[PDB]
Amino acid sequence: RPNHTIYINNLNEKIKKDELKKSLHAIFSRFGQILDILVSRSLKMRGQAFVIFKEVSSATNALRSMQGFPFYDKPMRIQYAKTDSD
RNA sequence: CGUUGGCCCAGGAAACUGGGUAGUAAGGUCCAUUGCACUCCGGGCCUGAAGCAACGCU
């Protein structure tokens, strides 16, 4: 069940928040329009991020073509989210 | 509050960018976490900032 944004985890716990998004935007800017990419470093939200797309088309593509993309030396694990208040 | 300069932290090869003007932001390190959020927030230790000027606006 596809969704505007996507949920990525297995991300590099050690990388700084602001560098992380930039790093991400770069890797996904090509798929469509990013409404926002959400990045937290708390205990619960860490090693994981939500990037929000313009349209559920980019997503499926991002997801299809980017699974296990070795990113900061670690294969990203990508999912469709479940909500996002756009 | 704001704009222009300073100055401090962070990024950068720079130009330039983000933020800020207290044991806090930040730097280092060790443990614990594979974790679904949208107002934020694990723990230990030794380190650890600048904190000005002119002008303008209710």
CATH code of the domain containing A80: 3.30.70.330
Interatomic distance A12 CA / B49 C1' (Å): 28
Residues with CB under 7 A from strand B: A 5, 7, 9-11, 13, 16, 18-19, 38, 40-48, 50, 74, 77, 79-85
Q: Exposed, middle or buried, A74 (CB in 10 Å: 0-12/13-18/19+)?
A: middle
Are A49 and A77 in contact by the 8 Å Cβ rule? The answer is no
Total count of domains within chain A:
1
Domain span at A20:
1-86
- Listed in sequence order, the DSSP H helices in A1-86 are 17-28, 56-66
Round to a whole number and report the distance in Å from the CA of A43 to the C1' of B32: 10
Sequence letter at residue A72: Y
Question: Resolution of the deposited coordinates, in angstroms?
Answer: 3.1
**What is the experimental method?**
X-ray
Q: How far is CA A7 from CA A2, A34, A37, A84, in A?
A: 11, 13, 10, 11
Q: How far apart are CA A52 and CA A1, in angstroms?
A: 16
| The two structure tokens encoding residue A19 | 């560098």
